[PDB]
Amino acid sequence: MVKSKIYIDKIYWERVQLFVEGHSENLDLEDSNFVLRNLTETRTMKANDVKIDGNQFVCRFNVAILDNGYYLPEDKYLLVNEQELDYIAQLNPDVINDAYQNLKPEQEEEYNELETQNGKINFLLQTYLKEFRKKTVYTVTPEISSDVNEFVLDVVVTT
């Protein structure tokens, strides 16, 4: 009934392993290839593992080694299923709700002063930020990139 689509249902980390759970609508995943692709499409990194159960998928990316034993480079990445077409993963609203349900008290107090839909969405996605310290700080934060109108992972490296 709906156009072929890929959705992200949940994002979480097990230390340096990034997991993305989701599902497709009107799209067989049997010959799918899930990748992170940067905004300019000059770099594509395949998932280290993909498990498919019917229309459900779970992707694992070992972010510490995706670049030939080094960490995923600083960039903005889309999650793409590369089949007959390239299907860019869409965020399921569940991800937004889960962020809201897990706000901490100080976060909740700041969130409650927000007045715009876009501000609320941006705030909630930013609570997913994951930071590694090795002093180099490596942060991975999801967002809706307004320019290309897509969910992305923003990877930023700081000293």
- Kindly list the structural domains of the chain, giving each domain's residue range(s) and its CATH number in brackets, ordered by start: 5-91 (2.60.40)
Cα separation, 102 vs 123, whole angstroms: 13
Strand partners, 158: 137
Ranges of H-type helices in 31-151: 94-101, 105-111, 117-126
Long-range contacts of the stretch 129-137 (C-beta < 8 A, 24+): 130/13, 130/18, 132/16, 135/159
26: phi > 0 → left, psi -120 to 50 → alpha, else beta; which? left
Cα separation, 57 vs 40, whole angstroms: 26
Expressed in Å, this structure's resolution amounts to 1.7
Cα separation, 3 vs 26, whole angstroms: 6
Strand partners, 33: none
Cα separation, 115 vs 112, whole angstroms: 8
